[PDB]
Amino acid sequence: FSELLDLVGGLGRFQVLQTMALMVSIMWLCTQSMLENFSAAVPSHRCWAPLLDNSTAVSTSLSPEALLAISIPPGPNQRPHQCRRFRQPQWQLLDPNATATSWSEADTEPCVDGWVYDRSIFTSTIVAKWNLVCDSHALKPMAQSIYLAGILVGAAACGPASDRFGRRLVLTWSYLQMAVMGTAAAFAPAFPVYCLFRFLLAFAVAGVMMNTGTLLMEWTAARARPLVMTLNSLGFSFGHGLTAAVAYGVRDWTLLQLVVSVPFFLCFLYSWWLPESARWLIIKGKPDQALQELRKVARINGHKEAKNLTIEVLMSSVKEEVASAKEPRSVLDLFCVPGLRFRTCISTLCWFAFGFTFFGLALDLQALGSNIFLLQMFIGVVDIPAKMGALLLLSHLGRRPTLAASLLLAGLCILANTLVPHEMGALRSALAVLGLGGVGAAFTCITIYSSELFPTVLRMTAVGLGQMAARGGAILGPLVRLLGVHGPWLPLLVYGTVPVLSGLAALLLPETQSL
Numbered sequence: 001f002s003e004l005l006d007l008v009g010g011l012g013r014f015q016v017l018q019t020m021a022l023m024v025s026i027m028w029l030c031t032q033s034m035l036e037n038f039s040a041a042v043p044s045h046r047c048w049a050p051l052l053d054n055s056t057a058v059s060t061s062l063s064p065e066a067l068l069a070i071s072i073p074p075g076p077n078q079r080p081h082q083c084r085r086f087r088q089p090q091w092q093l094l095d096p097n098a099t100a101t102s103w104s105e106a107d108t109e110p111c112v113d114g115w116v117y118d119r120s121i122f123t124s125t126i127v128a129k130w131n132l133v134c135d136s137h138a139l140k141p142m143a144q145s146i147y148l149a150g151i152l153v154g155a156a157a158c159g160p161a162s163d164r165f166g167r168r169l170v171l172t173w174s175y176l177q178m179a180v181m182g183t184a185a186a187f188a189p190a191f192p193v194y195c196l197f198r199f200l201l202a203f204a205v206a207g208v209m210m211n212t213g214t215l216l217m218e219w220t221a222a223r224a225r226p227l228v229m230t231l232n233s234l235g236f237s238f239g240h241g242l243t244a245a246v247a248y249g250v251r252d253w254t255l256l257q258l259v260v261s262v263p264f265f266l267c268f269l270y271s272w273w274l275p276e277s278a279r280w281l282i283i284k285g286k287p288d289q290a291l292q293e294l295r296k297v298a299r300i301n302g303h304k305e306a307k308n309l310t311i312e313v314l315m316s317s318v319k320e321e322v323a324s325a326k327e328p329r330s331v332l333d334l335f336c337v338p339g340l341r342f343r344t345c346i347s348t349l350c351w352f353a354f355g356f357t358f359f360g361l362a363l364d365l366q367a368l369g370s371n372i373f374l375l376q377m378f379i380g381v382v383d384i385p386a387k388m389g390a391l392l393l394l395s396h397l398g399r400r401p402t403l404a405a406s407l408l409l410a411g412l413c414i415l416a417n418t419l420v421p422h423e424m425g426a427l428r429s430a431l432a433v434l435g436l437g438g439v440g441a442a443f444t445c446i447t448i449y450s451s452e453l454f455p456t457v458l459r460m461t462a463v464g465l466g467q468m469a470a471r472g473g474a475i476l477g478p479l480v481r482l483l484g485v486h487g488p489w490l491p492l493l494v495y496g497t498v499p500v501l502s503g504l505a506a507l508l509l510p511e512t513q514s515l
């Protein structure tokens, strides 16, 4: 089939335009996942109280800070309490002679009247809308876990649907579903409905990812395939900065969600001009349509060979795969063979480490630094060169050292972030950025490396298993933040430990670079 591609053009105008078109949609797809750093930002909050918040109440000569001290006790963080208020105004606490021994838990009560939120940075957020605070604080990571579980289920459903219906058709309807569900989520009346719509949006996100990746491979020459994969990866790097800019411009969660969702109506529209995979059409016994698609691509590339292509070469050339693909093969086959068992274990561990670490760290930037807009931007700024250098290094120094070093660097940088004093926010932010860049380089390295570790018959099965492992770990990513009750260092300790152990294991893989 590579000869058919050469007759049509293995890397030309068509492939360039297609790659750009898909990269834009990947940028917006990235914005969809990173949105909840801003859409679900936690502002500073406190109980509503009469002396502070009922502006119609009798005025006094006291300043706002004195009223805040009179109304709200100091909390565990050595800062104003976020979930308890004084039952009666503590006038006794106003003099400098007072001491904390003068009041007890009997004087406190939960926020009967609700919470007051800081509006300086964000005009509105999900947390403020549905009071995902205090006793309900766990509901934010639950929502993110539901979104990632939606991705996992969408990936499970995409494969059979893609094979039965086609790459481009499923990509089109995934675009449409993303647009519809993202717009609907912006106007959700209640939190469970928001969760439902986010789940159904992730369901389509999975299809967009998988079919973009698949469709780029099948129209590209084998020699250029890794480079095209790397550019597809750079699409997310651009998505990060796009998220930072749009969130800087749009401080309202509904408008932000709507803005990042609307573009997918345009993606849905131009998906119709993309050609369906010719490999899929030939395999499914539709050579007449495959000829149309192939000569369309040749016309775009400007080749004269449209006068020479005929159904006979189309039918015969791919026939070998049409015959050999009739065997169903399974994940159990990988673990039966003694030699492949070890490679499979380590490869799946590395996939899991990538997914777990990335979606653990990237969705709580608020804990890593002071300014999340700038941090979000710099993640992409560093991700671009990290991914390109990963490509260069793995082509020059090998897959094994590159993957191992990337994972070790990410883990060591994240572990250091817990060790640095909290007051040095700049250094911690830099370490966080470097860790995430290392994670992106590791994603590139594992994507290229996993294809080369397995025999051609079992290649796709092992890669699918690895991807499922990564998407499973992504779910556990957010849940680990609930360990923050015992201190903010513990989640970062886990996030840093996992990549270190998986990177050390990667040193036990064989090298696949040609001599």
Ligand SMILES: O=C(c1cc(Cl)c(O)c(Cl)c1)N1CS(=O)(=O)c2ccccc21
Pocket (backbone or CB within 6 Å): 030, 033, 034, 209, 213, 233, 236, 237, 355, 358, 440, 443, 467, 470, 471
């Ligand atoms: O969600 C994925 C992804 C996961 C798997 Cl397991 C894949 O196979 C593919 Cl193609 C993509 N990414 C790849 S990323 O550049 O790290 C990145 C950065 C930011 C947001 C998402 C994301």
Ligand SMILES: *[C@@H]1O[C@H](CO)[C@@H](O)[C@H](O)[C@H]1NC(C)=O
Pocket (backbone or CB within 6 Å): 050, 054, 056, 057
């Ligand atoms: C605020 O204070 C006024 C004082 O007249 C009172 O009528 C009103 O009910 C109070 N509102 C709340 C929410 O406490």
